[PDB]
């Protein structure tokens, strides 16, 4: 139901120092009498947006910064307004990671990058290249060991290799070009082909997950793993003689890990926002607060300058920041969730042999592009229907598909508006859409109606065609400013409800083919 006033509920991932965070919670309770409950639910990054949308969930959510732009866009996060004195205590680049549309939407905690972790008793010198790992595995298999095991179920761990020879998520030049996705280029293919060849040649197993890789490294059965600072605690307990070092190069180029800033957001529906701010600023983001978490599971390079100066002498942190420098700080754009879902499926299907590398990355490209391509088509159709004049701007990336989808939608959507004028006029009058607040109300009812019953291109045409019908109404009553929000809302409904179906149709190319006369 509603978040309980007078306590704090905190969500953090089960691989992080949640017992250390609970100790900070106990210090908070000692001062204030306010009880702090720390939970680590499974899939909390997927659960948070579901429960927070209903005004429920934790007061504070911890995740890497990449997921907070989506949460902020969805209205699920309170704006963070620390004073200059507090802001100056953290590195400016960490605040940049938690800025979305010019507003701070979380507190940055620590910088995370993957490193190569190696067993000095099996491999005194780690391999500098991915290319030498097959030969090393052959040497180690003769000793009853293997070279490398890491999580193949989460694309976070394979991304550094995919990115090495030129794979990218969203092109960054000067600003992100969200229309420019680098998932199915020659560089991405080269990296994922290398991983699949390691599996084909029995150097790795497609079924290896976080738990299997951690157990094999910590038992001394595999010489190397790929993991973040949080993993170091369990390796210390195992008494493995380990090193943390630069990831291997691929085709002479560095592995490029996607760099995360562990961040703490405040639930927009929390009645405990002042308690949450007090906890995060004056208990957690202190030398003693971060020490308590770091002693449980290491954070990496903490955002708090005073404590980072103390930790920076650690060679494992130096290695973390060397890999971070060769990588890229993740975007926080709302499309990151879709990007990760698309690439997760691609790596798992390529690794298992369900798809070829070409097939897998083609689907991942379509899934990653789906929101922005859908919005380009739907925004243009609604606006030209409302105003009577087309947009002269270039379509940009995958422009032929956008142009031909808009041409098709002009033919079939104009026909739907003509033939279903009665139902459209009746429903427009019942909805009584007057302003941007009324447009924002449509999402819930649209999802309900559209998600029920059969999936086909005709119902997608009806969804967008009624959008155009509403947009014409909005322009006429001098609410033209409502049209882009309406287009965004319809696009969100379409892509969230029909993601998997749309990718199976080759997205908008399927639409053009389906309605080809
Ligand atoms: C006077 O005669 C009566 C006969 O009428 C029967 C009929 N025939 N037709 C064609 C539709 C209907 C009503 S029953 C479906 C319905 C629609 C709504 N409610 C509450 N119920 C309003 C909530 C809503 C739903 C939207 C919206 C999309 C863009 C937008 F800007 C605002 C939207 C608001 O999209 C749902 C999926 C697309 C859709 C479909 C579909 O999926 O097939 N149908 C059948 C629609 C009908 C209408 Cl009028 C509008 C849209 C659809
Ligand atoms: O695998 C995709 C996944 O990558 C990142 O998640 C990391 C997280 O940042 C780390 O702190 C650690 O918990 O491992 C996770 C990988 O299992 C992204 O932050 C996440 O959004 C994305 O889904």
From Swiss-Prot:
Name of one Pfam family that matches: SBP_bac_1
Which Gene Ontology cellular component annotation is one that this UniProt entry carries?
outer membrane-bounded periplasmic space
Record's protein name: Maltose/maltodextrin-binding periplasmic protein
Q: Which gene encodes it?
A: malE
Matches recorded under InterPro entries: Maltose/Cyclodextrin-bd, SBP, SBP_1_CS
Purpose of the protein: Part of the ABC transporter complex MalEFGK involved in maltose/maltodextrin import. Binds maltose and higher maltodextrins.
Task: Report the family membership.
Answer: Belongs to the bacterial solute-binding protein 1 family.
Q: What is its main location?
A: periplasm
List the Gene Ontology MF annotations in alphabetical order: carbohydrate transmembrane transporter activity; maltose binding
What are the entry keywords? Periplasm, Signal, Sugar transport, Transport
**Known Gene3D superfamilies for this protein?**
Periplasmic binding protein-like II
NCBIfam families this protein is in? Answer: PRK09474.1 (NF007011)
Assembly notes: The complex is composed of two ATP-binding proteins (MalK), two transmembrane proteins (MalG and MalF) and a solute-binding protein (MalE).
Q: Which GO terms describe its biological process?
A: maltodextrin transmembrane transport; maltose transport
Q: Where in the cell is it found?
A: Periplasm
The UniProt record lists the keyword Ubl conjugation: no
């Amino acid at each position: 139901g509603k978040i309980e006033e007078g306590k704090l509920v905190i969500w953090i991932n089960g691989d992080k120092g949640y017992n250390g965070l609970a100790e900070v919670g106990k210090k908070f309770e000692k001062d204030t009498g306010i009880k702090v409950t720390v939970e680590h639910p499974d899939k909390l990054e997927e659960k948070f947006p579901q429960v927070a949308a209903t005004g429920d969930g934790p007061d504070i959510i911890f995740w890497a910064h990449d997921r907070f732009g989506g949460y902020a866009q969805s209205g699920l996060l309170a704006e963070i307004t620390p004073d200059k004195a507090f802001q100056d205590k953290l590195y400016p680049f960490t605040w940049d990671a938690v800025r979305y549309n010019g507003k701070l939407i979380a507190y940055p905690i620590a910088v995370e990058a993957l490193s190569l972790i190696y067993n000095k008793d099996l491999l005194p010198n780690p391999p500098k290249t991915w290319e030498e790992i097959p030969a090393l595995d052959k040497e180690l298999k003769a000793k009853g060991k293997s070279a490398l095991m890491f999580n193949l179920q989460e694309p976070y761990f394979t991304w550094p290799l995919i990115a090495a020879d030129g794979g990218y998520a969203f092109k960054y030049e000067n600003k992100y070009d969200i229309k420019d996705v680098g998932v199915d280029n020659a560089g991405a293919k080269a990296g994922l082909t290398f991983l699949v060849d390691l599996i084909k040649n029995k150097h790795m197993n497609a079924d290896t997950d976080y738990s299997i890789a951690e157990a094999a490294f910590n038992k001394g059965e595999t010489a190397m793993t790929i993991n973040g600072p949080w993993a170091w605690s369990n390796i210390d307990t195992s008494k493995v003689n380990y090193g943390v070092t630069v990831l291997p190069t691929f085709k002479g180029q560095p592995s490029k890990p996607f760099v995360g800033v562990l961040s703490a957001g405040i639930n927009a529906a929390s009645p405990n926002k002042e308690l949450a701010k007090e906890f995060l600023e004056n208990y957690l983001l202190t030398d003693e607060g971060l020490e308590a978490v770091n002693k449980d599971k290491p954070l990496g390079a903490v955002a708090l300058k005073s404590y980072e100066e103390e930790l920076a002498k650690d060679p494992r942190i130096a290695a973390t920041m060397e890999n971070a420098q060769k990588g890229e700080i993740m975007p926080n754009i709302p499309q990151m969730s879709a990007f990760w879902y698309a690439v997760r499926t691609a790596v798992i299907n390529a690794a298992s042999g369900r798809q070829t590398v070409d097939e897998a990355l083609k689907d991942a490209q379509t899934g990653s592009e789906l929101y922005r391509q859908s919005l380009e088509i739907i925004s243009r159709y609604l606006r030209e229907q409302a105003t009577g004049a087309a947009d002269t701007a270039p379509m940009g990336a995958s422009g032929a598909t956008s142009r031909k989808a808009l041409e098709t939608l002009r033919r079939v959507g104009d026909g739907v508006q003509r033939n279903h004028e009665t139902a459209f006029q009746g429903m427009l009058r019942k909805l009584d859409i007057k302003n941007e607040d009324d447009v924002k109300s449509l999402s819930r009812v649209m999802i309900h109606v559209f998600s029920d019953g059969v999936t086909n291109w005709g119902r997608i045409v009806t969804l967008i065609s009624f959008g155009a019908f509403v947009a014409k109404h909005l322009k006429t009553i001098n609410q033209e400013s409502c049209i882009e929000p309406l287009a965004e809302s319809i696009t969100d409904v379409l892509v969230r409800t029909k993601r998997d179906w749309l990718v199976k149709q080759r997205g908008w190319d399927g639409f053009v083919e389906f309605f080809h006369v």
